[PDB]
Amino acid sequence: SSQIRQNYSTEVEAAVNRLVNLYLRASYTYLSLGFYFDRDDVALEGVCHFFHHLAHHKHHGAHHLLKMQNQRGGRALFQDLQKPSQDEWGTTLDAMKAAIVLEKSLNQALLDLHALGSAQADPHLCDFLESHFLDEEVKLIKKMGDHLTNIQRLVGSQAGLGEYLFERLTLKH
Amino acid sequence: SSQIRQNYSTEVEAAVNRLVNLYLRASYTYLSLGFYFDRDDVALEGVCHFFHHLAHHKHHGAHHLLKMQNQRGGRALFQDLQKPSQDEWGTTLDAMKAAIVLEKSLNQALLDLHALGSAQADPHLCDFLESHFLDEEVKLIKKMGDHLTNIQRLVGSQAGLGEYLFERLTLKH
Amino acid sequence: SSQIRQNYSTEVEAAVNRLVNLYLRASYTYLSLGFYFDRDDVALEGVCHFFHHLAHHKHHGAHHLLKMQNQRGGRALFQDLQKPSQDEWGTTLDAMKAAIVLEKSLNQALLDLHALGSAQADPHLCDFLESHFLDEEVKLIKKMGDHLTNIQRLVGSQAGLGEYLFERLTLKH
Amino acid sequence: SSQIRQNYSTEVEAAVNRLVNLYLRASYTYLSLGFYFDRDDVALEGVCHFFHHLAHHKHHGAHHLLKMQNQRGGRALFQDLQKPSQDEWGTTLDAMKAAIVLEKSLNQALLDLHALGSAQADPHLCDFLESHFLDEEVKLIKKMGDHLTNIQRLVGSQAGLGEYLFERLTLKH
Amino acid sequence: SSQIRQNYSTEVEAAVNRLVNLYLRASYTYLSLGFYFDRDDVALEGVCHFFHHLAHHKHHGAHHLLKMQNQRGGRALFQDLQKPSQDEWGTTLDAMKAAIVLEKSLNQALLDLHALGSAQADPHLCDFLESHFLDEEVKLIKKMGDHLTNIQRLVGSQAGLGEYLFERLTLKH
Amino acid sequence: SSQIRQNYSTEVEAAVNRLVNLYLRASYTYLSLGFYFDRDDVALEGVCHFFHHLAHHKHHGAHHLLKMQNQRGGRALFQDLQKPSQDEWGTTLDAMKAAIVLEKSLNQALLDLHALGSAQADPHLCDFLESHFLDEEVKLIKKMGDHLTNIQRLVGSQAGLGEYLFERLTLKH
Ligand SMILES: [Cl-]
Ligand SMILES: [Cl-]
Ligand SMILES: [Cl-]
Ligand SMILES: [Cl-]
Ligand SMILES: [Cl-]
Ligand SMILES: [Cl-]
Numbered sequence A, B, C, D, E, F: 001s002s003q004i005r006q007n008y009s010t011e012v013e014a015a016v017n018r019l020v021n022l023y024l025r026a027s028y029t030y031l032s033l034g035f036y037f038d039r040d041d042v043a044l045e046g047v048c049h050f051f052h053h054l055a056h057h058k059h060h061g062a063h064h065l066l067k068m069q070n071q072r073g074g075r076a077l078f079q080d081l082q083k084p085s086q087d088e089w090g091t092t093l094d095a096m097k098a099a100i101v102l103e104k105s106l107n108q109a110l111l112d113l114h115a116l117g118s119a120q121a122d123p124h125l126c127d128f129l130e131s132h133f134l135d136e137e138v139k140l141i142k143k144m145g146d147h148l149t150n151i152q153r154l155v156g157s158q159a160g161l162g163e164y165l166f167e168r169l170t171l172k173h
Helices: A010-037 A045-072 A092-119 A123-155 A159-169 B010-037 B045-072 B092-119 B123-155 B159-169 C010-037 C045-072 C092-119 C123-155 C159-169 D010-037 D045-072 D092-119 D123-155 D159-169 E010-037 E045-072 E092-119 E123-155 E159-169 F010-037 F045-072 F092-119 F123-155 F159-169
Strands: none
Touching (some): A010 A045, A010 A092, A010 B045, A045 A092, A045 A123, A045 A159, A045 B010, A092 A159, A159 D159, B010 B045, B010 B092, B045 B092, B045 B123, B045 B159, B045 D123, B092 B159, B123 B159, B123 C159, B123 D092, B123 D123, B123 E123, C010 C045, C010 C092, C045 C092, C045 C123, C045 C159, C045 E010, C123 C159, D010 D045, D010 D092, D010 F045, D045 D092, D045 D123, D045 D159, D045 E123, D092 D123, D123 D159, D123 E092, D123 E123, E010 E092, E045 E092, E092 E159, E123 E159, E159 F159, F010 F045, F010 F092, F045 F092, F045 F123, F045 F159, F092 F123, F123 F159
């Protein structure tokens, strides 16, 4: 029986715990993507840094959701975290395609939770997602789309050259 | 067929991937312990900070192991991460007892891997564990033992008072 | 046959060598007291620092006596140093009681040597003890008495709580 | 008859002198590789700087081994230094392949000496190699493997373009 | 029954307490050597400073061993400290010969304990001795050997002149 | 067929490669001389530093010759480097006599190459040797002659004393 809980539905509490799982799964996926690009037989430092920074960002997102759960008087509940969908991530292009799929799934989870908060008349939850997550997701997906276009442009008939140039001249090393 | 791999056994490579799993499980356990102490109905900030800093340290340990795996020409392989052993962690004393159990299990995993590296005549692996992990673990376990003794001293017949004073005067808020 | 010795009795020379033994025994006792309080199953950092600083002070006292022995043209002679009187030192209260007993024995040795110097009309020795040792001893014994009173006040019927609070709020960590 | 020698086998002393020869041969090989890339008809400044910095590093390694030989009470003995295996070093790719072969041979010599020190119960020698050489070698071989992968990616069907871009955008000029 | 002890044999615990005794005996020997050189009838300030700095170093070594004993969950046990082997230490040459004998005995005690730790599969103990003591001992013995050679060179048929010049031009005053 | 080579005879090109061999042999000789003086049973730090600085200078000379070979469009060709003429170098006097013999042989090689350049009407080569090498050699030989005179003065009938004083008061430690 919570001393602080007010206007915080069990449905939102549960959805917040599921979204924490999704963010931690996303962080784990980005950890795996980064270390694949660090392999001596892949060796694309800028791609490794791009994904490791996203791993840190998704962990921070989980921390914000868990802090908000406690601020509202909900109860953090952790589930098993599934391994990433692949052990090897192919080319930079394959990896950036897999990343935008992942981000679109996170974005839909955020929109779904926002819609539940709207239906539950939970404006604190709706504001929380707007201020911490919805514009970060739109900006990240726009950046990944920009990268996909530049990677695609660079394939031509010299894939290796393009993959090197993208990593050297667009990403940070 | 690795261009860099030299003196790096498949047995060590696999053991390193298992130890990464153990460190990431430990990080997840500390995430759960920290957010339990952040609950409005628990509210021990110094205990929350103690465990969240350990969560970050264990994540960094996993990152070091994964960097070393790639430096040696091994292949990072990620498995499902099991949820922490509890959803609620009891008193500071219960939590610090669970933490020293966890740390003793990590320490034994480090000693086991060191012994495998010794048997495989892999001095780079042995040095790596000595320089990054074995003394950090001894120092952390000594610190937890010191804390257990101070928590135990403070229980007396006023458990609440002792739990507050330990958090206020030994831990950092 | 000393080129510098003047007004320096064989009795004082010998007493100075015995007092060096007493100071080095005191330093050793404080080394043992400090490491007992550093044990994981004792874990009172401020008590450990209190005694280790006294170990350093008593070593410096021995160094001053040995420097003065050579300045007067006496001959330093070292004897076996006996181990401390205990291997385990009980509570902070037991330890501070043992420390004030030790300090009272040092103080009496200083007064005895001062009286011998007075009888031998050795004003340099008398001045030396007044300026380096007699007021330091009075001040240290007064400080230990103050601590004993505060420790005693804190025992009540919650010994553990009192022992923690004294270490946290009077001693330095 | 050495005044300082203790626990330092004739076998280790001799192996240390042979390893000094290997390091000085490696320094000489890197001197030759660097000046080949400085030729007006090769003209890859970043490749010249990469190899000349390794020449300096291998000379410093020899100096450390010779200092340690004297610290242990062994006797430095110098042998003829063989010229490098080639007069002309082909492409950047040929040169980086020859460098990783050379480094793998140095690394095996270090592991062999570490194993001899282990068998001779010479922990100072084992520590010395761990602290000065084994991780530097692993890190250098990982860096060369990363470079090989990037050079290979860049060959495509425009070898010249790739060789220029690698030197301009990965190496330092 | 220790809350922290893990992989720490009773054999190592006892050997660590004996090595503490050896270090404190060494500190006491250096205290006596330093004050002999401070005598008005010896008066070699640089030799006095050389030995007093070693006395401080050996005391610090004992403190490190005692800290590590508690970090591992062993129990510090102190024994009587025997007086130094001599009351008067002869020439600088006699004293530096006695010092290198002492250091070789400490070094053998360190190697013996390292070998016991190796046999007990105690890599934390082995690392601890490597990182804190084995190279300091090799470096100190090399320095003493260098000094012995310079002192020996200076004896000629004017021992006094040589002893003065060594103290003035090699040691620090 | 060189794009840059102009007025650069095959005779000079070959002589430059031989002089590189002589400089690298000289560097190796100075490496051996320096480590002999670092021995615990020789222990003359200033003599060790004197020779190690010359080893570095002779390596730099080789680097200048090799840079100039490429600037002129000649081709660096490396030969086996012979070990130094001795394993042990006797007294400071023996060593400084061997050094001035070595320097006189380098100086004659420089004069011989200058004479060949003069005969070949190669003023760039002649200027190069004048500006980088001929005055450095004259100055170094003058310094060694000055040292020989001071060492010789100091032998008297107390060789050891003189050898110590020269190292302490003329050379740098
Ligand atoms: Cl799965
Ligand atoms: Cl589970
Ligand atoms: Cl006793
Ligand atoms: Cl050859
Ligand atoms: Cl005795
Ligand atoms: Cl030869």
